[PDB]
Amino acid sequence: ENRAQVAARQHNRKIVEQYMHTRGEARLKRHLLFTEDGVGGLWTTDSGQPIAIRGREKLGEHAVWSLQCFPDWVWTDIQIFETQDPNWFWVECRGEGAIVFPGYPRGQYRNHFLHSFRFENGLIKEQREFMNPCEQFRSLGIEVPEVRRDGLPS
Amino acid sequence: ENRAQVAARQHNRKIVEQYMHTRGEARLKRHLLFTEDGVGGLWTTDSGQPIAIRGREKLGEHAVWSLQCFPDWVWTDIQIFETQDPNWFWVECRGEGAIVFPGYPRGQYRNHFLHSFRFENGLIKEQREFMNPCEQFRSLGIEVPEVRRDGLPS
Ligand SMILES: O=C(c1ccc(OCCN2CCCCC2)cc1)c1c(-c2ccc(O)cc2)sc2cc(O)ccc12
Numbered sequence: 001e002n003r004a005q006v007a008a009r010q011h012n013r014k015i016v017e018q019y020m021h022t023r024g025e026a027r028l029k030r031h032l033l034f035t036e037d038g039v040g041g042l043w044t045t046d047s048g049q050p051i052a053i054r055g056r057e058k059l060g061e062h063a064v065w066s067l068q069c070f071p072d073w074v075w076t077d078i079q080i081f082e083t084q085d086p087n088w089f090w091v092e093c094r095g096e097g098a099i100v101f102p103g104y105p106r107g108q109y110r111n112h113f114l115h116s117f118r119f120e121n122g123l124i125k126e127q128r129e130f131m132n133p134c135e136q137f138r139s140l141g142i143e144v145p146e147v148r149r150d151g152l153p154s
Numbered sequence: 155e156n157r158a159q160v161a162a163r164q165h166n167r168k169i170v171e172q173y174m175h176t177r178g179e180a181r182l183k184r185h186l187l188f189t190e191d192g193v194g195g196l197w198t199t200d201s202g203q204p205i206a207i208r209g210r211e212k213l214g215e216h217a218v219w220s221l222q223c224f225p226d227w228v229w230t231d232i233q234i235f236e237t238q239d240p241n242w243f244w245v246e247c248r249g250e251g252a253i254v255f256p257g258y259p260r261g262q263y264r265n266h267f268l269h270s271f272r273f274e275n276g277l278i279k280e281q282r283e284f285m286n287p288c289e290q291f292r293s294l295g296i297e298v299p300e301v302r303r304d305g306l307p308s
């Protein structure tokens with residue numbers, strides 16, 4: 001059992017590293033790192049509900065959209081965390097690039113991210129990214145509300 | 155080396171468990187889980203800058219404010235992740251409780267959280283919590299902006 005777990009963790013880490021380093025046109029093939037029913041998405045949005053992209057066909061379509069709306073995106077400062085579950089990794093990183101959203105001015109978007117990767121049979125079954133949406137609001141020119149801090153100790 | 159790493163990870167895990175289960179008046183003593191120069195705080199805020207509380211004395215003072223502002227806070231759905239670093243843990247969980255911020259109506263706040271715990275010599279050197287601030291805005295009656303999604307594939 002231990003040999004199987006160690007083997008799974010070392011392979012899975014290679015997939016996480018490949019995912020994090022996928023840039024440019026190679027993003028069009030990143031759905032091949034997922035299971036056929038694999039899910040990937042953004043868990044932190046304005047609405048409070050995740051934007052989850054389900055299955056390889058939809059994952060490949062999102063990649064096409066992502067090459068237009070995040071054309072030069074890169075992950076930086078990547079720190080990969082293995083866990084006690086050989087099939088579950090976390091990654092802390094930053095991301096940055098142009099943001100080209102329909103109906104908004106072209107901007108520059110930078111944020112801090114956490115990613116969760118869960119594996120099944122050597123491929124990603126579930127990828128989730130978590131960030132602070134206020135920074136994406138700022139990149140799009142959307143006003144961010146401010147919590148009033150006068151009564152809070154500082 | 156392996157003996158020392160295994161011992162560190164087992165002890166540190168117990169501290170993470172104790173931290174996550176601390177509620178009520180026991181919150182007043184939770185700063186004793188930190189190093190004298192330990193830091194804890196919220197890394198995801200409206201301003202984009204962390205709210206970091208530095209040093210055991212200030213951590214103890216924030217606990218007094220925390221018991222006023224979040225009088226019945228509970229962490230739920232706790233999943234603790236050990237990592238390859240025996241001194242670094244991540245936690246995925248939910249949190250809920252009344253929110254009683256100065257000058258806002260009393261609310262009920264629920265959110266999903268990620269926590270990072272870094273240890274030094276048996277105590278927490280750095281705790282950081284990450285969430286979606288839009289859910290805290292909702293709990294305070296603050297309007298959340300909406301990204302227009304008409305041009306995005308759905
Ligand atoms: O910026 C995004 C977004 C960014 C990345 C996403 O997923 C990243 C993970 N990735 C998805 C498939 C490929 C591999 C994993 C999802 C939404 C937002 C949106 C989006 C983008 C494209 C699309 O077709 C539908 C909705 S909508 C939105 C609202 C917000 O408040 C914040 C971000 C957003």
Ligand SMILES: O=C(c1ccc(OCCN2CCCCC2)cc1)c1c(-c2ccc(O)cc2)sc2cc(O)ccc12
Nearest residue numbers: 147152153194195196199200201205207216219287290
């Ligand atoms: O909700 C918080 C907040 C909550 C928890 C925080 O820290 C958590 C860690 N802390 C130290 C270690 C032990 C546990 C408490 C910090 C800010 C926000 C604020 C706060 C609360 C109390 C205070 O005295 C000063 C500022 S201000 C603010 C603005 C936002 O956009 C979001 C949250 C907030």
